């Protein structure tokens, strides 16, 4: 109950959070290179700034384009013991915005 209701100190080092981002992107590269299953339309990916990004041509004034990176602690390296699976977390870009 402490750890669930615990909250960190309010300062976040912005140099730190950059370094988190670097290590995070880098860690998605780790994952993805040894992530078991990529769909072939996804075979080209960009490991963005913070993000993983994925592009497939599409209409309605946009491309079908999703960005993934994930917050599950336990797996971060276990994501590789779980080659089968992973929590991934998305951020997809279309012409709309709110929805």
């Amino acid at each position: 109950t402490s750890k669930l209701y615990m909250l960190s100190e309010s300062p976040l080092s912005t140099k730190q959070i950059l370094q988190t981002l670097h290590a995070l992107n880098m860690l998605i590269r780790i994952r993805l290179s040894l992530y078991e299953i990529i769909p072939t339309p996804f075979q080209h990916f960009t490991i963005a700034n913070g993000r993983c990004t994925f592009t497939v041509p599409n209409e309605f004034s946009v491309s079908l384009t999703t960005n993934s990176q994930d917050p599950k602690s336990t797996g971060i390296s276990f994501q590789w013991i779980v080659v089968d699976f992973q929590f991934h977390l998305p951020d997809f870009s279309s012409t709309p915005a709110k929805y």
């Binding site: 109950t1 402490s2 209701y5 615990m6 909250l7």
Partner: protein, 99 residues
């Protein structure tokens, strides 16, 4: 706006004891039921309790829990859940076990 009526020595004896009260979870629960967390003045007084973490001052405090309790209470969702009886018992039981 009544004129303040405090005592110097007495209020550090008292603020020590109040920190101690904060160690008790049931006191937090009653405190929440009485909606003392609704008042901003209270929260500023909490930060005034931050003076008690200082070494010469903390050297006096008896029950360590309060300190932890204090950092726990900095999350407001935690305040509404210490209004809850169930979580209250969870916290008491958690100390009891550490003890």
């Amino acid at each position: 706006l009544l004129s303040k009526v405090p005592d110097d020595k007495s209020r550090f004896e008292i603020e020590l004891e109040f920190v101690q009260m904060l160690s008790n979870p049931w006191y937090l629960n009653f405190l929440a039921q009485h909606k003392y967390f609704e008042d901003e003045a209270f929260l500023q007084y909490l930060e005034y309790m931050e003076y008690w973490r200082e070494p010469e001052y903390v050297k006096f405090i008896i029950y360590p829990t309060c300190l932890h309790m204090l950092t726990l209470l900095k999350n407001p969702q935690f305040r509404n859940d210490i209004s809850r009886a169930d979580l209250s018992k969870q916290v008491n039981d958690e100390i009891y076990y550490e003890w």
